[PDB]
Amino acid sequence: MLSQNVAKTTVPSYYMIRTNLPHRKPQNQWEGVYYYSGITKRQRHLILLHRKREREAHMRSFNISRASVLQRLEQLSGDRKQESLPPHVRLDLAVRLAQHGLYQQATPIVDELHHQKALHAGHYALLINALACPRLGQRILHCDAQCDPALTYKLLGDENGEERAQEAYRWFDLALTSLAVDVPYLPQGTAAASHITNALMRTLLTCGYTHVAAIPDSVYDRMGSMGISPTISTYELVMLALSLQGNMVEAESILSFLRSHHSEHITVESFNALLLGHREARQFDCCDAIWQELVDRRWPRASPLTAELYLRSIMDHANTPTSEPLQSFANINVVEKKKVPLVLAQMDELGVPRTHLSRVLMDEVEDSLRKFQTYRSRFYEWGRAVKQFDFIEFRRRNGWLYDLHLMKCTTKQVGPLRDFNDPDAVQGAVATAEIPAFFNERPAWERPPLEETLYVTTNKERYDDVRGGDIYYDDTRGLHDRSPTWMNEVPETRYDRLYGVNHPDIAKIGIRRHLNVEYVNRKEVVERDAALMKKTLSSGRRLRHRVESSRTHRNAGSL
Amino acid sequence: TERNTIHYGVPIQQIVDEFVFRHRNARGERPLDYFKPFPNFRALRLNRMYRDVEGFSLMKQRPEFLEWELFTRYRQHHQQRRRLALLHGLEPVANETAQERDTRRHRLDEICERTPFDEREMRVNDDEMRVSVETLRSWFGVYMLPSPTVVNAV
Amino acid sequence: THGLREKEKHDFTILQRTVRIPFQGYDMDRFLAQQKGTPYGAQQLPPNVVPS
Amino acid sequence: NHVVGRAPEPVVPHEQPQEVLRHFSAEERAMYEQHVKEQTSRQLGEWERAM
Amino acid sequence: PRNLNHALNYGIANYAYNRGNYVETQDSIWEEQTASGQEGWSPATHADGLREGLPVRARRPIFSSSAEQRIAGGPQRAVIIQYHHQPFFNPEPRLVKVAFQCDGTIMEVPISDVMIWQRRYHGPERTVGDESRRYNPAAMRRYVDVTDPFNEKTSNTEHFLDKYEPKRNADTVADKYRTTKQITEIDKWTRYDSARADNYRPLSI
Amino acid sequence: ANIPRSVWDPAQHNPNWSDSYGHDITNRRAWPARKWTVGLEPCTPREWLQFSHRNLAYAYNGALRACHSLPSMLLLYKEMKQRGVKVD
Amino acid sequence: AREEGYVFHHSNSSRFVEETYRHPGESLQSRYLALQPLHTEVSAKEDFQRLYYQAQKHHKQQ
Amino acid sequence: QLQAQDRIICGTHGAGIVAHQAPAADLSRTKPHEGTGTSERDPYIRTLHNQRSAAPESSVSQSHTVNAPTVDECEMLAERWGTMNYWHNDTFPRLVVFLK
Numbered sequence A: 001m002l003s004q005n006v007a008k009t010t011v012p013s014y015y016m017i018r019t020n021l022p023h024r025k026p027q028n029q030w031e032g033v034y035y036y037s038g039i040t041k042r043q044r045h046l047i048l049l050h051r052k053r054e055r056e057a058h059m060r061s062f063n064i065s066r067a068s069v070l071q072r073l074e075q076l077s078g079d080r081k082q083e084s085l086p087p088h089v090r091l092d093l094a095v096r097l098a099q100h101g102l103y104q105q106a107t108p109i110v111d112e113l114h115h116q117k118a119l120h121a122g123h124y125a126l127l128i129n130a131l132a133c134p135r136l137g138q139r140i141l142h143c144d145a146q147c148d149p150a151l152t153y154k155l156l157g158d159e160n161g162e163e164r165a166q167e168a169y170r171w172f173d174l175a176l177t178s179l180a181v182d183v184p185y186l187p188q189g190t191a192a193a194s195h196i197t198n199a200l201m202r203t204l205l206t207c208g209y210t211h212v213a214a215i216p217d218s219v220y221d222r223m224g225s226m227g228i229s230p231t232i233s234t235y236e237l238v239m240l241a242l243s244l245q246g247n248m249v250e251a252e253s254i255l256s257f258l259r260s261h262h263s264e265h266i267t268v269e270s271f272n273a274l275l276l277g278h279r280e281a282r283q284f285d286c287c288d289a290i291w292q293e294l295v296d297r298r299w300p301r302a303s304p305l306t307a308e309l310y311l312r313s314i315m316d317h318a319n320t321p322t323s324e325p326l327q328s329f330a331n332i333n334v335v336e337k338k339k340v341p342l343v344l345a346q347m348d349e350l351g352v353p354r355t356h357l358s359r360v361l362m363d364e365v366e367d368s369l370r371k372f373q374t375y376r377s378r379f380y381e382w383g384r385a386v387k388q389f390d391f392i393e394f395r396r397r398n399g400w401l402y403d404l405h406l407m408k409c410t411t412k413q414v415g416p417l418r419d420f421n422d423p424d425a426v427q428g429a430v431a432t433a434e435i436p437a438f439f440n441e442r443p444a445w446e447r448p449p450l451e452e453t454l455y456v457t458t459n460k461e462r463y464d465d466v467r468g469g470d471i472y473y474d475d476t477r478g479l480h481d482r483s484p485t486w487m488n489e490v491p492e493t494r495y496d497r498l499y500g501v502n503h504p505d506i507a508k509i510g511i512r513r514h515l516n517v518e519y520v521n522r523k524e525v526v527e528r529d530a531a532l533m534k535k536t537l538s539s540g541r542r543l544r545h546r547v548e549s550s551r552t553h554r555n556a557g558s559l
Numbered sequence B: 001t002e003r004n005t006i007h008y009g010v011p012i013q014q015i016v017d018e019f020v021f022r023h024r025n026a027r028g029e030r031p032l033d034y035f036k037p038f039p040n041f042r043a044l045r046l047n048r049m050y051r052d053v054e055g056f057s058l059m060k061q062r063p064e065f066l067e068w069e070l071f072t073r074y075r076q077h078h079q080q081r082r083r084l085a086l087l088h089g090l091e092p093v094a095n096e097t098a099q100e101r102d103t104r105r106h107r108l109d110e111i112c113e114r115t116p117f118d119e120r121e122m123r124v125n126d127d128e129m130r131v132s133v134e135t136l137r138s139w140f141g142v143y144m145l146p147s148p149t150v151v152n153a154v
Numbered sequence C: 001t002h003g004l005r006e007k008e009k010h011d012f013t014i015l016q017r018t019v020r021i022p023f024q025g026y027d028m029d030r031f032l033a034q035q036k037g038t039p040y041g042a043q044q045l046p047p048n049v050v051p052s
Numbered sequence D: 001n002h003v004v005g006r007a008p009e010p011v012v013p014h015e016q017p018q019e020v021l022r023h024f025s026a027e028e029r030a031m032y033e034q035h036v037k038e039q040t041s042r043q044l045g046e047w048e049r050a051m
Numbered sequence E: 001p002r003n004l005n006h007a008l009n010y011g012i013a014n015y016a017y018n019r020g021n022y023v024e025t026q027d028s029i030w031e032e033q034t035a036s037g038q039e040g041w042s043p044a045t046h047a048d049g050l051r052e053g054l055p056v057r058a059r060r061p062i063f064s065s066s067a068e069q070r071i072a073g074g075p076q077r078a079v080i081i082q083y084h085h086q087p088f089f090n091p092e093p094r095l096v097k098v099a100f101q102c103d104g105t106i107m108e109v110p111i112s113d114v115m116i117w118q119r120r121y122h123g124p125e126r127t128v129g130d131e132s133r134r135y136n137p138a139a140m141r142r143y144v145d146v147t148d149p150f151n152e153k154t155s156n157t158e159h160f161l162d163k164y165e166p167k168r169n170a171d172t173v174a175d176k177y178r179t180t181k182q183i184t185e186i187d188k189w190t191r192y193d194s195a196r197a198d199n200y201r202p203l204s205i
Numbered sequence F: 001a002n003i004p005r006s007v008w009d010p011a012q013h014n015p016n017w018s019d020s021y022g023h024d025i026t027n028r029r030a031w032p033a034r035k036w037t038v039g040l041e042p043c044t045p046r047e048w049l050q051f052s053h054r055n056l057a058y059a060y061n062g063a064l065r066a067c068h069s070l071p072s073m074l075l076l077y078k079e080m081k082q083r084g085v086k087v088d
Numbered sequence G: 001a002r003e004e005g006y007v008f009h010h011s012n013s014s015r016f017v018e019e020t021y022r023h024p025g026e027s028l029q030s031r032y033l034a035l036q037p038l039h040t041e042v043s044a045k046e047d048f049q050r051l052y053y054q055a056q057k058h059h060k061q062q
Numbered sequence H: 001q002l003q004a005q006d007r008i009i010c011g012t013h014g015a016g017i018v019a020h021q022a023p024a025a026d027l028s029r030t031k032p033h034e035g036t037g038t039s040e041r042d043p044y045i046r047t048l049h050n051q052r053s054a055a056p057e058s059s060v061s062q063s064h065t066v067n068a069p070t071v072d073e074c075e076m077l078a079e080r081w082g083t084m085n086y087w088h089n090d091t092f093p094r095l096v097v098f099l100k
Helices: A041-080 A087-099 A103-116 A121-131 A134-143 A149-156 A161-179 A191-205 A209-226 A232-244 A248-261 A269-281 A284-297 A304-319 A333-350 A359-372 A386-397 A494-498 A522-537 B012-023 B067-088 B098-114 B133-140 B148-153 C004-018 C028-036 D026-050 E022-036 E175-179 F020-028 F045-050 F053-066 F070-083 G048-059 H071-075 H094-099
Strands: A455-461 A472-478 E040-043 E055-059 E075-082 E095-099 E106-110 E114-118 E143-145 E180-182 G016-019 G039-042
Touching: A041 A087, A041 A134, A041 A359, A087 A103, A087 A121, A087 A134, A103 A121, A103 A161, A121 A161, A121 A191, A134 A149, A149 A232, A149 A269, A161 A191, A161 A209, A191 A209, A191 A232, A209 A232, A232 A248, A232 A269, A248 A269, A269 A284, A269 A304, A284 A304, A284 A333, A304 A333, A304 A359, A333 A359, B012 C004, B012 F020, B067 B098, B067 B133, B067 E022, B067 E055, B067 E075, B098 E022, E055 E095, E175 E180, F053 F070
Parallel strands: none
Antiparallel strands: A455 A472, E040 E114, E055 E075, E055 E114, E075 E095, E095 E106, E143 E180, G016 G039
8 A cells, every 4th residue: 555646537527528638747858768777785785795705805815925924934034043044035025024014024134134234225225115015005905995096095004104104214214324335426316315215205105194294395305405316206206195185286286397397207197196186185177177188198198097096086076965055956966977988988099998997996887887878779769658667666666756747746736925015916827837845835933843743744635525625635633642532532540540630749659669668759858958948048147245345455245 | 074065155146146136126236327328237237346446545435526536547547558568568477577577667667658648548437527637737736647847857 | 943043044134135235445455454453543442431 | 654664563363352361360361461472572573683 | 574564554464565656556466467367368359349559469460372371470569450340341250450560561360360468357348447436325315317317418618609608597497407317216126127037047046 | 077167166256247137127228218308319210210310400490490599599509519410 | 495484386487586675775765665676586496417417527627 | 356356255255245244052063054143254154165266267378478588498498499479579589598
């Protein structure tokens, strides 16, 4: 039984033959054709289960890699013991430990290598890069960050970023000292120094917010003071540092400088850095502008990561809700998903592979495609009767028929307003519109309280001859309404003896008195307290004797 | 993180329409030129104060007499100065320096001193009175509208 | 829930009919400073209040 | 003409009126006065250094 | 410190120019607008206030028999001798007659080949300078003469016919004061105005 | 990117965008046709067909003849010259 | 640089200078007129490699 | 060229035409598009957009407006391309400085 299924057609009679009233609603041109773009519960469950399976497989791979590196470290130490071993073995072991995040074991190996003087500039760069934990970053990207590079950078900080940042700074200082032993400018300006600085910035990118904020204003300025010539990688890393913190005013200006003075040196990564910054700063219009600039350039050769960043930005903008005045109707930001097929076509033209996108993003991409990517062959048939009526049947089965042109018949009407300018003239309607009824509502202050829980209202139809009036009228009964003679229609109980008393002393009829032997009344307690409070002010004055003290001596009297 | 919910503010056009509808055409706030036979769009919108009045301190907050006409003459003088700069190729550049702007202003002042004023381009707004340059000089003094002889003497 | 907040909002809308645009002044900064009392010679002594 | 190189008004941040200074405690009042005097002293000193 | 020029305007905000100097103040406003890009050379349009003696920068055409089509050139300063807004006086592609001040030559160039100095970004007339209007306290107490709203019938320079007009009581009683009407009573608000649709594009109704 | 920035950003506000209730009132007005006493301003194409500056000279001649005083004739002549009608 | 106050800003039409105002000699102009600025134009970029290259052959020449 | 445009239009919830002047709630989590109507900074209806404010794109083309010759442009002046108007413009011709 459903309360929405009502009688669309009138009871058969001779009016249907002797009157010109149409027997069907005229077609609504603005209401679009009903098409199928939903997901069933089992399909969603299967998608979630498969994502969990792939994520646990990636976690298992990370675990076996950690076990392998730990076993190698232990067996290497035990086997070597007193016997000397080549420095490169310990160097690669430390690199692997750092890449897997085992900085605790990585530090002593690097310290002893530096004391042995077997580490060079390239090896220092390797160690500093390994401190960033690329393997842990990949694992967390697949498992926790949901393949979101921004979330990877945001979550790698919590993996003891500050301690690793301090260790990286110490390694950079000792690397500079070990590089100085290779006239007043050689240690400062050289390729190795710039490479080491780039490595330091790269490993600081994965630390906490404090270090990523300190990169562009402390590390860059210190490099400038030392006099180390920066590189395109340095500019990329400082751009990424500025973008992760949402400060795009400077991230745009630095790229402008790169395009002006150091053109034909900008690589792809600048565009994804700007895209990431705009996505973090909720500047999707500027993100779209940068994507269009990239697709017009075509030389930076937009990466799968760049395409994924732009798609994620547009989908986040699609899911962002608007304010209430724009939310009175259906949400308007869902239109942003219509741009996805355009982006996919542009990726086909640019040669960016479609499969390189993360599967988490691909699920939502396929959702938006099934919502806004109908082909011409299926467009030739989606307009029929069977499909629309099947959609109607599905809506009826799910009990949602409030937004269907065919199955909804409206009965409520709104009358005119009597203008006080000239009330003599009467007004007649000249058209009819299906206004959604929140345009002209009763203002709240002349409405019963919330009108929903206190009162239950049902809009039914009179069975008597209307002869003109509201054929469909609503009844408004209170939720707590009961029959006026409910007392004798319900079985008699213990409370019948309290008939008519305004404030009965329920404690006398109470049941707890007999079960508890230490009974005491809060009413008696407060009565005693009030009596004591009255006694406080019921003290009274006292007749006080006075003795003259005009003279020098204070007169003293006895009893 | 407060930008997750996008809040499109009410447009300025919507605000102006609501204000004028509430005020029933806002006859007081509309200019006097609006009530003329064929007003152009410039004299159609509202009476917001623009940046033309900046720099003129003769009238602090209420021009008592002829100060508005003097200000109109001054702003038309500056309009003609701008026109002369445009003709002679002394337009401001986006990235001028101090030693550029001062010299450019000096050259423009040379041109302005050597170029006569054009009285035909003067126009009268709503409720304004036409006053001759001779009348303005006699009232406020010749230094307000100096002859080139007065300029070089100063 | 009673909607008195909406009532006061509608009352504000009603008063918006009666209100008018203030005269911001020819020189905006000069007028604002004159209100603030910052510029030289524009300081106004606070009104004298009868003591209790 | 009246002012040529004179210092500007030493505007103090978080300036409170008497209606707020009434509820300040004794040490709170002393702290506020110390803040005001330090601020105005710094303003005058920087103006002197600039002049 | 930034308060070096506070002595120039004590209390009011510090400025890097002379507020008392009106022409310098307007010039500095011009400088800041050109720096912010709100003013500059933009391609001309018909709706812009093209007229006689309007400073525009147009590309000099080069005349060559080898080229079937017109040849463009360097954009340099020019003065508009005349420009007919009438389509029957300059059909597509419409031309504007210009004089190049570098040598003095007079030519006709297409409107798309003319660059004009804008003052704003949205205005239909980007070349006409903005005009400020005097503030009136008695906003609703203004009056307009329906007979001569523009005061075009003013005496201006006195002539020998004026002296013969005799002042009398009937002359003193002015028909101008009879014809003068109030701005409030000039217009009437109607139900069409109350139900007027939006001329712009609404965001959400 | 769907709703253009130019309709909700106050920075891109159109300085000279008139309101919806102003231009219609501006063009609705029909000013009185008696700008000058002698002639009537034409408001319809038929009145324009009848109207001519040369023809106004005949009515001004008649009114000038009806005038009995030289100052009144001078005032009417000033009105005629301000209108710019033909003098014969 | 950050401590003394500096941010990344660069556009197509951008220039970089060192700013010093002309010293106001005691007169009417100094008393009343605003100070005249003085901008010495400098490069927006500094090439450490070319600076070191210049110094390298500026040293051994001596 | 409206005066005080940033403060009036982009800074005031009333756009300069709304006069903002039961008690207001003490600790209220008001909706993003509303307020308690206590002062200008807390109007009944908020007008300023929550998103960023961007000035309209300039309608002046920089490809035809020659700028001042920067000291940084001089080094690459021998290695830079320009049109004949760029080389021989009325203000700051670049061929002269290239020869100098």
